[PDB]
Amino acid sequence: ITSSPVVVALDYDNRDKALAFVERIDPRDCRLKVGKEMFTLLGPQFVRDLHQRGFEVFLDLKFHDIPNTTARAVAAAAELGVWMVNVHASGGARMMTAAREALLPFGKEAPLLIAVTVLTSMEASDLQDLGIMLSPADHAAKLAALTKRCGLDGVVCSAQEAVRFKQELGQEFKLVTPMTPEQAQQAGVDYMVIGRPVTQSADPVATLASINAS
């Protein structure tokens, strides 16, 4: 297992460079996130290699499709054994319900099922283009609320909103964040994705130690 809430983003262009960083660290100190870049390049096999090496994996593919296809993609993630997988709440309640129901047969050995609400990249201008008058946080709030209605395990959101979300949605609703690793823990966050501060550091392990220690 691992006591850490830290998930280290592996956003590498190349297999060996990723694994050479992964050798330098220990499954006890963090989990790993595998996103669309490395998955499109290497496939589930890279996730298996991380599993061999003892790590738990957040498969961050942000599934956004019709309900049958998302349910089958999420079930494939569960068959792969990953620890967390995410879907777009923008896919709607039926799609999330279907992703949830696909995991029921896996029991307590299913990955956590997290919704992306509003991508951290989106400003209000981006939202106007798509016909969303609200602010990024009000729309994210509405999507988070829809996510909890469908019984998913939690949402991706800013640490700024952790306070507000743990309020409206409950303590057990997991908040994943893609404001210090101390300030965020106190404000509600459950797991913390951190990339370059760890992967571009000199002693990622010590950096890991330092974040963890707080």
Add this chain to the structure above:
Amino acid sequence: ITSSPVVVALDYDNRDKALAFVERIDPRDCRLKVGKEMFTLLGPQFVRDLHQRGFEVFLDLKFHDIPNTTARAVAAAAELGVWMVNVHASGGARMMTAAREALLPFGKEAPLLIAVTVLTSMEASDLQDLGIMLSPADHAAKLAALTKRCGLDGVVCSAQEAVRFKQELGQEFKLVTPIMTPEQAQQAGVDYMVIGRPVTQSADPVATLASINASL
């Protein structure tokens, strides 16, 4: 390369079933669509395996992420040599621009870059949960217009919007459709037509395809 506008959806749950079907057909008669069902199970190597068999491939993963991540995913698809790849218009105009710019190094060898607008699964009630009061057809038209503004090659849409989108967006702008029949889809202006079970679960898929192509 085939002259057929048919793209047969590979939505199997294992490699051997998929290959049993694919080895029955000829790459001159159709293209193949690989979506999340099979990419999450078998990864990019399955795409390379289909190319070894001579097929062109629509990688249907519907990338919806921040711009710099989508852009890397799109370039990974072009490095794979796929014929088509898609993204969600919902990711916004900067994500689509970043996707298009990721294909500039690949020149004429680049995949066609297509944006999903509204998934065919979404009814008005599914959209209202999200704060969209526009009808699906109108929300898709809005996303389709944004897609063309960003310089992408076309959109996924229903044959029911085909005539509309060709009027609004022009003959060059590609329409990929996933009840109207093939010939009627063509007549409406659809460029490429994804077809799944009618072919994959047919008695003789070689014969079902040939009948489809004959009407086109």
